[PDB]
From a paper:
The SARS-CoV-2 spike glycoprotein is the major surface antigen of the virus. Here we have examined the structures and receptor-binding properties of spikes of the B.1.1.7 variant first described in Kent, United Kingdom (now termed Alpha)10,16–19 and the B.1.351 variant first described in South Africa (now termed Beta). Recently emerging variants of SARS-CoV-2 have acquired other substitutions in the spike including a number located at the monomer-monomer interfaces, at the receptor-binding site, and near the furin-cleavage site.
Similarly, we also show that the Y453F substitution in the RBD of mink spike, a structure of which we also report here, only increases affinity for human ACE2 if residue 614 is a glycine but not if it is an aspartic acid.
Author numbering:
A (entry chain C): 714 to 827, 856 to 940, 944 to 1146
B (entry chain B): 566 to 617, 641 to 675, 690 to 713
C (entry chain B): 961 to 1146
The structure:
């Protein structure tokens, strides 16, 4: 049975979006030349299909950034006074004396991450995303899971933490008798995360590099002659008469169309992958943040207590605080105890003996208590159960009757 | 001179040697904002990434719509935090995320 | 788009094979035919790739819908904001063309009210904690109520278990717990 606990806070990095880019088909395939545009007219509808395919991804990204963050109806605000029972949320809460409303951890995360081509701006400004995140933090800190469904109801933070301990299966008095130690451990964990981040966001960095490499390959593909005499339309036009020049021109057109189609296809695959990541992030925000999860390893290693969201460039960062048992101590156990010919079973907990006396205690923590009829319910005679030990069960009413 | 993409970013004048930078002329895209055919047929034309009722935005130059300081819920999103809606001239505004609520929190108060 | 792709030259003199065959001798007509067949083959490949990419999204949505059928319909779900908004109760499936419609039923509280609360009550030097519920104050008296609904009950030993002593708890109040045994033992 464990006899102690430790509070641990970890991080999770999930990308939710990618840069929106659009490439004009006519400009890339053909330079500013009337003759070149005429040849491309035969290859009907390809340019329109490619432009529509890119526009689909462009709008899907703005859809992705919406559902993960915009899950609150009213922008909540934390009270000016800071009385959270010894818990220090200064690091994650927004800092007013800064050009933006981003917190310290968000600032560190931002600092860590570093021919007819157009890059469209994202629809949500970073300040709006920071405002959404601050709303989520304020709601979680003050209300709890109540603001998740049916308006916000204020609760003192200590009582909310007691409810979460009750949720994970530990009695609530454990919190009230050990509040200071838990506050210190939580503060230390937050400090350690702050230290660790300053000294990696590998997940978010890969997408930027991949997109940049794809664009660079598109730009490089122009210099190839694709089996023609030269790689520039203007030289081909002057060097040869139109009837012989047209074959070189169509060779170049075919090559450039092939390169553009390859780029579009790989972009579609990458967009699908990013969509999957965004859906996972949205589910995590719904369940881990706006509630307490019973799913194992979904919201961090160990028993889950709560989560705090943060904002990173083209992604979201989750901080999962959990409960981890420790300080194991060995014991001896029995399935049931029968007194006066009738078996007794625990209402909740275990029968445990240090070697001389028998007690009943809860499973996740060592809180020995004397055996009483208030802690047990009878089922029958001793015969049916195997391993049933002999011990006495105290009666509370009898001495008072005396 | 050239750059990483192998495009000639700079040249030198053969006479009176001087370094000259080359920048392409502004190309972009045209978008049309309309409130619907059944409603009054007034549109606004937005030029993507072009620097010019002319209102300059981060997304581009906007013609045919008047700027207003008031904030409303987003409709017909232009981009980069600007949403334009019809109220007779089309108006462009900075969208408001939501209503501002300050929940009253005390260490001995519950609801 | 596939049907319209058939009427494009793709570099040939005409978009109809019969027109090409009559006007030109076979040795020269074969090149014109080859251009057209290459173009049409390219269009067909593009169509097949697009259909595969769409089928992936459709099957992902089908898997999500199947998960919602088993969890929301066949049982009660604890996952928040998975089956509707609010505390989920039950769902009813409906059929739609190439799709399915769920009618989620939820429970949403309303009409909140202020109250004063205390973690525990100190009586006779021993702290009492609520087994299930909250301590709330009318303003002159103390009651224990369930969290989601307001149903005040008088504080008794049958409602509160005892653990520890008065000193440890940070915020504690003084009240009297009524013991049902004493009035009967009269
Ligand atoms: C539990 O762990 C804390 C922190 O290491 C320590 O201070 C304490 O003495 C341990 N034991 C108990 C019974 O709390
Ligand atoms: C929270 O921590 C920061 C940095 O460790 C410190 O400056 C601040 O005073 C702390 N807040 C409280 C209430 O102790
Ligand atoms: C077991 O616990 C009881 C209760 O305090 C104590 O009297 C007894 O000595 C303990 N036995 C051993 C072997 O420590
Ligand atoms: C546990 O196993 C040992 C070894 O077989 C056996 O002697 C003992 O009776 C077992 N105890 C119970 C309670 O089954
Ligand atoms: C438990 O008590 C019963 C009462 O008669 C007795 O028959 C049995 O042998 C006892 N078992 C042990 C292990 O002492
Ligand atoms: C270029 O030619 C003009 C013509 O008079 C002359 O004045 C100038 O010095 C020349 N510059 C160079 C660099 O040769
Ligand atoms: C335009 O608005 C009118 C009045 O509400 C309505 O009757 C009509 O159906 C609308 N037309 C369209 C195309 O929505
Ligand atoms: C547009 O051009 C004017 C004139 O040079 C300049 O002052 C302004 O800063 C430019 N706007 C942008 C967004 O570059
Ligand atoms: C009850 O709470 C609300 C918070 O919305 C507050 O405005 C009101 O003053 C409170 N009433 C009392 C009597 O404290
Ligand atoms: C509740 O408090 C009011 C005064 O605020 C008092 O008149 C009433 O009797 C109290 N009710 C109970 C059941 O204590
Ligand atoms: C609640 O806050 C008030 C004002 O800061 C303080 O006087 C009181 O002692 C606090 N109560 C607890 C239990 O900390
Ligand atoms: C409760 O009663 C004790 C003993 O009379 C007293 O010391 C204390 O100040 C009272 N107030 C509290 C803590 O509720």
């Amino acid at each position: 049975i464990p006899t102690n606990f430790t509070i641990s806070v970890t991080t999770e990095i999930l990308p939710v979006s990618m840069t929106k880019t659009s490439v004009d088909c006519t400009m890339y395939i053909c330079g500013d030349s009337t003759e070149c545009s005429n040849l491309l007219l035969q290859y009907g509808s390809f340019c329109t299909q490619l432009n529509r395919a890119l526009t689909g991804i462009a709008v899907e990204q703005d859809k992705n950034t919406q559902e993960v963050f915009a899950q609150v109806k009213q922008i909540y605000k934390t009270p000016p006074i800071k009385d959270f029972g010894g818990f220090n949320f200064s690091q994650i809460l927004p800092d007013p004396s800064k050009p933006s409303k981003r917190s310290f951890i968000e600032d560190l995360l931002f600092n860590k991450v570093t021919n007819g081509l157009t890059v469209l701006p994202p629809l949500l400004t970073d300040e709006m995303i920071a405002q959404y995140t601050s709303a989520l933090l304020a709601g979680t800190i003050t209300s709890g899971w109540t603001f998740g469904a049916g308006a916000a109801l204020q609760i003192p933070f200590a009582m909310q933490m007691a409810y979460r301990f009750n949720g994970i299966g530990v009695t609530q008095n454990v919190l009230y008798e050990n509040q200071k130690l838990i506050a210190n451990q939580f503060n230390s964990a937050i400090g350690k995360i702050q230290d660790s981040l300053s000294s990696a966001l590998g997940k978010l960095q890969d997408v930027v590099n991949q997109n940049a490499q794809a664009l660079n390959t598109l730009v490089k593909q122009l210099s190839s002659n694709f089996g023609a005499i030269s790689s520039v339309l203007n030289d081909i036009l002057s060097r040869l008469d139109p009837p012989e020049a047209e074959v070189q021109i169509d060779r170049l057109i075919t090559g450039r169309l092939q390169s553009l189609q390859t780029y579009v296809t790989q972009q579609l695959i990458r967009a699908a992958e990013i969509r999957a990541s965004a859906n996972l992030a949205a589910t995590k925000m719904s369940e881990c943040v706006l509630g307490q999860s019973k799913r194992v390893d979904f919201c961090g290693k160990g028993y889950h207590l709560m989560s705090f969201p943060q904002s990173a460039p083209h992604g979201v960062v989750f901080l999962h605080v959990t409960y981890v048992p420790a300080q194991e101590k060995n014991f001896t156990t029995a399935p049931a105890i029968c007194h006066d010919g009738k078996a007794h079973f625990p209402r909740e907990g275990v029968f445990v003996s240090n070697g001389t006396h028998w007690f009943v205690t809860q499973r996740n923590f060592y809180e020995p208590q004397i055996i009483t009829t208030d802690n047990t319910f009878v089922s029958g005679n001793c015969d049916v159960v195997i391993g049933i030990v002999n011990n006495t069960v105290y009666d509370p009413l009898q001495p008072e009757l005396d | 001179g050239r750059d990483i993409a192998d495009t000639t970013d700079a040249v030198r004048d053969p006479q009176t040697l001087e370094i000259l930078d080359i920048t392409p002329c502004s190309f972009g895209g045209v978008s049309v904002i309309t409130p619907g055919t059944n409603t009054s047929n007034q549109v606004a034309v937005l030029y993507q990434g072009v620097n010019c009722n002319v209102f300059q935005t981060r997304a581009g130059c906007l013609i045919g719509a008047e700027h207003v300081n008031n904030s409303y819920e987003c409709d017909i999103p232009i981009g980069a935090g600007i949403c334009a809606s019809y109220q007779q001239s089309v108006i462009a505004y900075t969208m408001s995320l939501g209503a501002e609520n300050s929940v009253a929190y005390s260490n001995n108060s519950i609801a």
